[PDB]
Write a protein that binds this ligand. Sequence first.
Ligand SMILES: Nc1nc2c(ncn2[C@@H]2O[C@H](COP(=O)(O)OP(=O)(O)O)[C@@H](O)[C@H]2O)c(=O)[nH]1
Length: 315
Amino acid sequence: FELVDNIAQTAVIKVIGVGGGGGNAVNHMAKNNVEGVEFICANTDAQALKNIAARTVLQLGPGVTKGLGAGANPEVGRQAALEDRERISEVLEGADMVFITTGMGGGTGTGAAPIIAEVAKEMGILTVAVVTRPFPFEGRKRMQIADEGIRALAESVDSLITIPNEKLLTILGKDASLLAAFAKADDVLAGAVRGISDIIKRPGMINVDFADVKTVMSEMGMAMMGTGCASGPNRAREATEAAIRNPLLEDVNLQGARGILVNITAGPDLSLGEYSDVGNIIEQFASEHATVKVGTVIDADMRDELHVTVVATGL
Ligand SMILES: Nc1nc2c(ncn2[C@@H]2O[C@H](COP(=O)(O)OP(=O)(O)O)[C@@H](O)[C@H]2O)c(=O)[nH]1
């Protein structure tokens, strides 16, 4: 309750997007409602890094690729990354937590991300990776590489949030279309990152800190998440139902999650009343052993709506 942690709200959070898709997702975040974090784009494609939101960029494998980017080849991404080990670390120093975000299935992102996680993880930084999985319409070829990297990535991250791009279609449905599909991806990834950092950076009346997060998140590996967003007299219960009922949490057995982290983002009116509801609903779907951390986020530039965001760790 009363006693807060060592480096609570103060935690220096960096967010790095690897490869193309990643850069896109990141640059989206910048030009959006994602504050308290330092953005960074890291691509082997020197070209891509030209003129982008994030004020910190890192070109990988200058030698290996010559600013031409690992032609969808993971190995080239991994090689370019190892070449830049030093540079990677220089960019990471001072971070309490790092967000490696990227679209798996490509070359830069796929092969480079695991290395970067490896670095940070060594520096003793809370390493969380938020990555997508090719849309069905991307070919088994690409979908094959994704699993591949994800397997490797998992080996060196405190936690790994997978996002089955398929599900995004589920949602979209009618308006499903390349533009929207990837735009949606961008958005969801932003949610995942914003989802957690906001809990640390923009606390509400009841708050969770870095110590709380470190717990449910440190070396848990393999996570999934889902969002809900209601409003009106029962925005609480509703927004929560919607969260669990989120497709992105369709085939997930919360009873299994060793750790569950929750985020309630609402106006200055978010009463303790609701908070209780949010947690009660959760406490049922969770395994009595599971360690559940529920926190509040405060947002003014938002009204009656109350968005809940759950994250199942140590799956
Ligand atoms: N969210 C999001 N995902 C993307 C975008 N572009 C591509 N992707 C996905 O992420 C993967 C990475 O592809 P790409 O960025 O070309 O790989 P890179 O070689 O690491 O640059 C793809 O296979 C897609 O499924 C984008 O703009 N946004």
